[PDB]
A paper describes a structure:
The human p53 tumor suppressor is a 393-residue protein that in response to cellular stress, acts as a transcription factor by binding as a tetramer to a wide range of DNA response elements, activating various events including DNA repair, cell-cycle arrest, senescence or apoptosis. Mutations in the p53 gene were observed in more than half of human cancers. To uncover the structural basis of rescuing p53 mutants by MQ we investigated by X-ray crystallography high-resolution structures of the core domains of mutant and wild-type p53 bound to MQ in the absence and/or the presence of their DNA response elements. These studies reveal diverse binding modes of MQ to specific cysteine residues that stabilize the proteins and their interaction with DNA.
However, in the crystal structures obtained by co-crystallization with MQ, referred as R273H-MQ (II) and R273C-MQ (II), bound MQ has been identified only at residues: C182 and C277 in both mutants as well as at C273 in R273C-MQ (II). C273 residue is unique among the p53 cysteins by being a result of a DNA-contact hotspot mutation common in human cancer. Interestingly, this residue is extensively modified in all eight monomers of the two R273C-MQ structures. C273 is located in a shallow depression at the protein surface surrounded by residues from several regions of the protein, and hence providing an attractive target for the reactivation of R273C by a small drug molecule. In all monomers, a pivotal hydrogen bond is present between the tertiary amine of MQ and the amino group of K132, being further supported by the negatively charged E285 side chain. Other stabilizing interactions include direct and water-mediated hydrogen bonds and CH···O interactions of MQ with neighboring residues from other regions (S240, R248, I251, E271 and V272). C273 is unique among the modified Cys residues as being an oncogenic mutation. It is noteworthy that MQ bound to C273 is present at high occupancy levels in all p53 monomers of the two types of structures, R273C-MQ (I, II), obtained by the two different procedures. Each MQ bound to C273 is located in a depression at the protein surface and not interfering with crystallization, as well as showing extensive stabilization by intramolecular interactions with the surrounding p53 residues. In the current crystal structures of MQ-bound p53 mutants, only two of the four monomers (B and C) show MQ-C182 conjugates.
Author numbering:
A (entry chain C): 96 to 182, 185 to 288
B (entry chain B): 97 to 183, 186 to 288
C (entry chain A): 96 to 181, 184 to 288
D (entry chain D): 95 to 182, 185 to 289
Write the structure that this text describes.
């Protein structure tokens, strides 16, 4: 029906972090803590940090899924528009909005019962002298895409799961994929 | 040795596979990274046919296994003596690859190369869908003693017209194993 | 052609298991994982477990055969000492080292060409509560019997075959038949 | 009762346990609480347990470890790994066994044929030249929190010294918590008092 977006830090103290990028014209990805909202460009690197209080064990996986924010649209699967879904696809299904770049162990799922799309990578701990793990996501349509997201806001849900799929952690953030993230962030904050 | 050269041809013939993931319970899962299908003995292994334009009536779709390794490549891929034992329906008992849920299936023992293949009529996608799905079954395990014996194989898929002329070709590696999800997840860890 | 001792799990994921019996004076059979060696008493029950990932068909058979481990003895048939051959249960040939107890469908072979002894039983799936199938082997000579094994080490080769004789899998283990299995395991491990 | 004996006894060799004074820093993988007689440790990591004696036991002496549930309503339940961790093995240990010994090739595992309890045994070796106690490195192979396993029930490890013929010589015990953050979990449990 609808996957849960309820924040769940769980046993490992799972939290998300984001670079402090600002709102200048050069910025290709910028997070608003006031809005809990990422502003990023089509197909460009979006860094997401995983912060934990304890290290989950090897075989832990990190999954990302998008849903529609508005209750009227929430049961609709978030997918790429017909224009963009036309098969640079590498290892990714052409319909999927969310890709991970720079990870050979990436796995993509079409849920056989919910038909929802997700992308999964193995959780790796931070490098020694590092405090967080970084996944580079790419968003493969614009929020404005006719016949896809069509200006409807989306949430990204990031779940930590054990090797059997059981929930260990869940966080979420709103996403706008737009041409001018710095400008769009600064304008959306000024209201 | 049968040609394994990718050939989209005149109708833009491509293969697709479900995005099944690697849950322990999955019956069949394809690794885009390895171009490799992981599936269970005698269970459904869906293969999608995608075309840019519709092949003419009487087009056929053939599947044939060969060994991947150079020094096993002339050897005909067939079931182990244990599994070859009769028990089979429309399929020859020695054939590794079957098609299920197609009453028009045809099986060939090449009288000259002795290779096994399985053929069906090409049907366009059903109402609503963008691809044609063929349910293959692999009737030995990759680890069968006296059969494949842990040796890797490729499946070659060919689109042919009514007269047996080549229209398209593609291929993928196959592992027939107890737990496809685990085995894909493990093989991808390198 | 000395029989093959090469391990094959095969289509059914065939391996061997043994009870974790310890080395107390009272123990009648104990297996050493570090030595891959079973220590047992003359004529006493020696449980050997069959573990499979997938159930082979009814009609599947399980064969045991002993061979000398040392290369210069490998071509000699392993058989009971003169004393011990001269006792029988009424199914076992008096020269066979390995019997199966508590199985009315046991079959014994003297190979027409090699002259090697083996004992076969039907494969049955695990009983309810169990993840493995247990065969009770009896070894009918002592390792030290002069005129039989005469302290020469031996392997038992366990083969899983179908109703038609086709080989499905193989595994093996070393055996010592002795008065005090617990003490001999403890002593041999202590190198 | 049916449950095996937990009562402390130093016996003839004056047998007792010791534990390193490791503190509670975030990096610590195991830490013992003298106030709680309780060892906090991480899944599958080294857990040093010291054997202290007044006189040297004969060669052939053995040191056995066994886990029991602490709470009287669970005491008769055999302690074993959860079904998930049973599926994950060094080839010497049974996959169901909670307690392993690391780095001892003479290790022996027992499944009791009548109690069905698990235990792990090693030979007693005297202290090396320039040491005053023998150290065994235990590994605990399931979390305290594991569902279908300990399921948050506290356990005791019972350490027995026994002769070559199985005669009990001494017995000691300690509570154990297998957790993600031993340092943090020891501090929190000590501050309720
Ligand atoms: C891979 C696993 C197994 O080992 C059996 C068959 C399929 N899944 C679930 C049980
Ligand atoms: C990116 C931008 C849009 O196009 C609408 C949805 C999300 N965000 C606000 C309005
Ligand atoms: C475009 C289409 C194809 O033809 C294959 C690659 C991606 N997509 C599904 C299968
Ligand atoms: C087993 C054998 C038969 O008896 C007929 C069907 C299949 N195979 C060939 C002919
Ligand atoms: C399934 C697995 C095997 O058993 C061999 C062939 C293919 N794959 C790698 C090796
Ligand atoms: C049982 C014991 C013996 O008697 C010799 C052969 C195997 N093992 C070691 C030496
Ligand atoms: C580690 C912790 C737990 O999870 C329960 C048992 C022992 N300790 C206290 C409660
Ligand atoms: Zn788009
Ligand atoms: Zn086979
Ligand atoms: Zn004898
Ligand atoms: Zn566990």
């Amino acid at each position: 029906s609808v996957p849960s977006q309820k924040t769940y830090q769980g046993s490992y103290g799972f939290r998300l972090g984001f670079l402090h990028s600002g709102t200048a014209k050069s910025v290709t990805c910028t997070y608003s803590p006031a809005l809990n909202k990422m502003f990023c460009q089509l197909a460009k690197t979006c860094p997401v940090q995983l912060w934990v209080d304890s290290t989950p064990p090897p075989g832990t996986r990190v999954r990302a899924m998008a849903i529609y924010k508005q209750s009227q649209h929430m049961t609709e699967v978030v997918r790429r528009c017909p224009h963009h879904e036309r098969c640079s696809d590498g290892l990714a299904p052409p319909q999927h909005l969310i890709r991970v770049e720079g990870n050979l162990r990436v796995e993509y799922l079409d849920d056989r019962n919910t038909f929802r799309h997700s992308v999964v990578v193995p959780y790796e701990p931070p490098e020694v002298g590092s405090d967080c793990t970084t996944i580079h996501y790419n968003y493969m349509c614009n929020s404005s895409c006719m016949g896809g997201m069509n200006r409807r806001p989306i949430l990204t849900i990031i779940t930590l799961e054990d090797s059997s799929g059981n929930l260990l952690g869940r966080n979420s953030f709103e996403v706008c994929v737009c041409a001018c993230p710095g400008r769009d962030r600064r304008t959306e904050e000024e209201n």
